């Protein structure tokens, strides 16, 4: 398959190879804060990243992914809306060409400068590939980025991007602590949705944190120097790698907080 974010292969085209693009639980969505209902039955989220073991960073021609060892319960997400244990496999971001767009989820139609996705799979399904055959196979923790002060825990990521400029390039990225990417509060919204890139599979319990992290203009500027293209192809800056909000259909967004 041959998909991207431009006019000729972007989100409006995806449904041809991936008909689920027009499905009943697609992501992202707009989070209308006045329709999301506080659910007192939701447990606190448990983010257990102490033993996280990062492996590599990769430019896949769409975004960059930091990949983890998911063989054992090293870095897991539990609680909140989730039954059982979900293992961290990778994180990546979506961002804009300018600060007024870049997020996938929106909050009362507000677009943030970027959005971080920490992707986890349900350990009752044994591996990630099996998990994406299940409606509760994945849990993605989404975190908005706004431009302000630098996020120190992001800097190691920023510092390596020069080495993975183009599609297919990777670099060692062991000993990275994803706890440094989290805001103070774990207040969240949650709803059932999908992967936001092809193959757009409808497997995801979304957990979107209310509090954005702040990153510096210099940090996001370095994201925007990456390339979608491979080396030796015309340069196309990796910006605006976000899918717009999709129809909510018959879904409810729940809030963990009043
Ligand atoms: C069914 Hg994913
Ligand atoms: Zn994503």
Swiss-Prot record:
Location of this chain's protein in the cell: Cytoplasm; Cell membrane
Outcome reported for the amino acid change (mutating residue 60 to H): Reduced proton transfer
Signal peptide as annotated in the record: none
Residues the UniProt record annotates as site (Fine-tunes the proton-transfer properties of H-64): 5, 60, 65
Documented EC number(s): 4.2.1.1, 4.2.1.69
One Pfam assignment: Carb_anhydrase
Effect of mutating residue 60 to D: Strongly reduced activity
Activity vs pH: Optimum pH is 6-8.
Active site: 62 (proton donor/acceptor)
Stated consequence of mutating residue 140 to H: Impaired activity
Known outcome of mutating residue 65 to Q: 2-fold decrease in enzyme efficiency, as determined by kcat/KM ratio, and efficiently inhibited by chlorzolamide
InterPro entries per UniProt: CA_dom, CA_dom_sf, Carbonic_anhydrase_a-class, Carbonic_anhydrase_a-class_CS
Amino acids binding Zn(2+): 92, 94, 117
Gene Ontology MF terms in the entry: arylesterase activity; carbonate dehydratase activity; cyanamide hydratase activity; zinc ion binding
Effect of residue 140 to F/Y: Strongly impaired activity
Illness: Osteopetrosis, autosomal recessive 3: A rare genetic disease characterized by abnormally dense bone, due to defective resorption of immature bone. Osteopetrosis occurs in two forms: a severe autosomal recessive form occurring in utero, infancy, or childhood, and a benign autosomal dominant form occurring in adolescence or adulthood. Recessive osteopetrosis commonly manifests in early infancy with macrocephaly, feeding difficulties, evolving blindness and deafness, bone marrow failure, severe anemia, and hepatosplenomegaly.
Extra remark beyond the main annotation: Target of drugs used in treatments against glaucoma disorder and breast cancer.
Protein known as: Carbonic anhydrase 2
Gene name per UniProt: CA2
